[PDB]
Amino acid sequence: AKILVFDEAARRALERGVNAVANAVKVTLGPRGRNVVLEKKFGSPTITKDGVTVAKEVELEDHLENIGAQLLKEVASKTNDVAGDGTTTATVLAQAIVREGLKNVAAGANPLALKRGIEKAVEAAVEKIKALAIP
Amino acid sequence: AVKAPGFGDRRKEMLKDIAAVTGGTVISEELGFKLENATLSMLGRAERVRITKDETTIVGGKGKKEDIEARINGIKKELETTDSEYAREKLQERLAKLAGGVAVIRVGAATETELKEKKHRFEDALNATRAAVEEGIVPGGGVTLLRAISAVEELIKKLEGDEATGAKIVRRALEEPARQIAENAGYEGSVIVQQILAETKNPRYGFNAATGEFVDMVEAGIVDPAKVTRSALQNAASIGALILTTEAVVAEKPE
Amino acid sequence: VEDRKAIEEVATISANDPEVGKLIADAMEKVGKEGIITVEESKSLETELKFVEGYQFDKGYISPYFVTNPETMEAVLEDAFILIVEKKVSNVRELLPILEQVAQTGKPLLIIAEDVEGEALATLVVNKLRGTLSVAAVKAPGFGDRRKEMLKDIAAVTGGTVISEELGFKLENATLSMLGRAERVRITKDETTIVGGKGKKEDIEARINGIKKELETTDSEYAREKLQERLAKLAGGVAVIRVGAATETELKEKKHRFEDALNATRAAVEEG
Amino acid sequence: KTVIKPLGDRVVVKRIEEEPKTKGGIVLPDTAKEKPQKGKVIAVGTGRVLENGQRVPLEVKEGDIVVFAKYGGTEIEIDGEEYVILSERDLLAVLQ
Amino acid sequence: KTVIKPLGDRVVVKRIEEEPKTKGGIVLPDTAKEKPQKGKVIAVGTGRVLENGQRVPLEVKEGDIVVFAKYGGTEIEIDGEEYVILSERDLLAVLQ
C-alpha cells in the first residue's frame, strides 16, 4: 500500500507540491495583490486575498506532491495562529527557502549543515527586526 | 480545600503517600475512621503549602522518615512486577514526588512538525541515559561492535563446517553499523572500517563521522549505552537467523 | 521409559534441542511422572525452570497492612486458619464470632471470600495492626461460577467448608472447625500461595479427578486450558518452564518446541 | 450553665461509648461500632398522666444506667454536650 | 458483675438454639433454622402499673422456659452475651 521514494525524486515531488500552493497564494501579496476564488460546496464561492484561507483549500491529487502542499500550509496557518496576519509573506519565504535550498542539496550540500546555517541566519535576521522595531 | 490527587485506587495510595510525607493520618473510610472523631494527633503537618488556581505544593512535610522510605520501597518492590510501561510511569511519578525530585523539560519549537521531532529527540536521549546507567557505556560509531569482530574471529578458529560459516556471517555483519554511519556521512564504509580495525592498541579508537577524523571515541564523547548495542545485535541476529531457515512460505494468493 | 536419561532423550529429539530436553528431564524428574509441567512466556532472554509449592492463585492482599514482612511486602502466616466465604463480606457482625474464636486461638487467619469491603475489612486491618489477630484478606480465586468451583477446590485441599447456601452454612454461624488450615501462607501484592494444605486425600483426589473427567469432553481451547489450570493448582509437584527469547517470532516457536517435547514425553511414558 | 426539664415521662440520658476493644480484645473500627443503647439518666420528669389523672412515677432514678432501643427518642445538645430525650416506652431496663 | 433491671412488665430472656437435628434425625442447615421462640427468663421486672395504681406481677418466674413471638422485642448484649427484652404481650406461654 506504500511506495518508497528516495533522493531527488522525492525532493522534486515535494517541491512541486510546495510550489503548487505557494503560487496560488502569492497572487494576493501586497497592495496590488489580487483575489483567489475558492469554490464552496453549496453557496456562492469565497473571494479572498488571505493567504491561509486559500492555502487551506489546496489539495493535490498526487500523494507526494500533496505532502509538500501540506507542509507549506502549516507554514501558513501556524503563522495565522501566532499573529493572524502575514500568512502570504510566510508562504513566499518558505517557497524561496525551499528552492534555493533544494538546489544546494542537489549540488551535494549537507542538509543538516544547511539547517544550522539557516537557523543562525534567521536568529541574526530576527534580532535585526527587533532592532528596527518602533513602539 | 483541594481535591484528592489521582483517581481510582491511586489517589487512595497517593493520599497515604501524602500522609507519610506530612506525618498525618489518612481518614480512610475503609480503615474505620470517622471524620467527626478526628484529632489534631492524626493531622498532617508541613512547613509550607502553596495553592494556585490548579496546583498544590506541600513544602517542608513533617512526615516520619521511615514512613516515607517504607512508602517508597513499596513502589520499588512493586515495580519489579509491573509490565505495561504506562503503569510503570504512574508508579514512578509517585516515587518521584516522594523523593522530592521531579524535573520537567518543556520543549519549544516554531512549528508543530519541528516540535514533534525535537520533543522526540529528548525522549530518545532519556531512554539512552536510562540504559546507560543500567548496563554501562561503550565507544560509539559502531566502533564497539567492530571490536567484537576479533572475538568472533577467535571463536571461528574453534569452529568448523557451516557453523563456522555462521560465525563468519556475524563477523561481516558487525561492520554494517560503522560502515553506514560513515557512508551516510560521505565516506567509504570499507575504507574507514579498515583503518579502525587497523589500530588495535586502543579499542576506543574510532571514526568521528561528524568531523571526519579518527579519534578516541570515549575521549571524544562519542559513546553508546552498552545496553542498546547488545540488544540491537541480539534482536537482529534473532530474526536474521530465522529467515535463513526458510524453505517454504505460505502466503495469500495475490488479489 | 525408566529414568532421567530415557526422558531427556525423547525430549531432546522431539524438540531437536539438547537444552530443551534437559529442562524437560530435570522438571519431569523432580515432579514425578504423575507430575505437572507448564510452559510460560518468561521475560528475560533466558529460559528458566522453576518449581512451585502448593495451591496458588494470582490474587493478593486487599490491603498492605496485612504484610508480615516489610521488605518483601508479603504476608507469611504459620499454621493459619482459612475461612472460605463464597459471597462478599462487608457486614462485620457476621464475622465477629469467628474472628474471636480465632483471635483467642492466637493463630494466623487467611480469609478467602468473594471480597472483603467496608468495616469488615477495616476491622481486619486495625486488629491486625494492634496485635489483636494476624489476618490477611484475599479476593476470590477466579471469576464467575469458575471461582465458586475453585472455592470448593481451595476447600478440598485445605480441609474447610465453602461458606455458601449450598453447603448449608451462614457466616456468623462459623466455627474453628468449619474451616481449613495450612503450614504457611504467602501473599504478595498480587498472588497467594497456600502452602501445605490440610484437606484430605479423597476430597481432592476427587475434586481434581472430577475436573479431569469433564476435561475429556471439552474441545474448547479456552475451557480446555481453564480446567487444566485448575487441575494444576490442585497439586504440589508443579514445574514451570518460562521460555525466553529475543523476539516474539523466535519465542513463539521456541515455546512451541517445548510443548511438543512434553507431548512426546507424555506419550513416551504411556506406550513406551 | 442550664438545666434540662423533661416532661410527661421523658428522661434525659447521656449515651456511653462502648469499650475500644471487645471481649476478645478485638479493637473495633469506628465504622463497625454503632450508637450505644446505654447511658445514665440526667433528668427524670413528671410521671405519665394516666387516664384517671394519676401520675405514675418513672421507674428510673435520676442517675441510673439505662438500656433503650438506640433507634428511638429525639437527641439534642446543650452548652457543648449532647443527650437523648427518651420516653418510658423506649426505656427497656436498668443496669445494676 | 452487672445485673439487668427490666421495667414495666418487661422480662429478660436468653434464647435457646434448636437441636442440631429434628425429630427425624435430619441435620438442618443453619440457613434453614430460624431464631428460636424460646428462652429462660433471667430477670422479671416490676409488674405493669394498672389503671388504678395496681402493679400486676408477671405470670413468669425468674427462670422459666418461655414461648414468645420471636419477631418482637428489642435485643441487647451485656458483658459478652445477648438477650431479649420482651414485654408481657410478647410472652405466649411457658414450657413445663
Ligand SMILES: Nc1ncnc2c1ncn2[C@@H]1O[C@H](COP(=O)(O)OP(=O)(O)O)[C@@H](O)[C@H]1O
Ligand atoms: N502601499 C504599500 N506599499 C508597499 N507595501 C505595502 C503596501 N501596502 C501593503 N504593503 C505590504 O504588503 C505586505 C503583505 O500584504 P498582504 O497582502 O496583506 O499579505 P499578508 O497575508 O502576508 O499579510 C506587507 O509587507 C505590507 O507592508
Ligand SMILES: [Mg+2]
Ligand atoms: Mg516432532
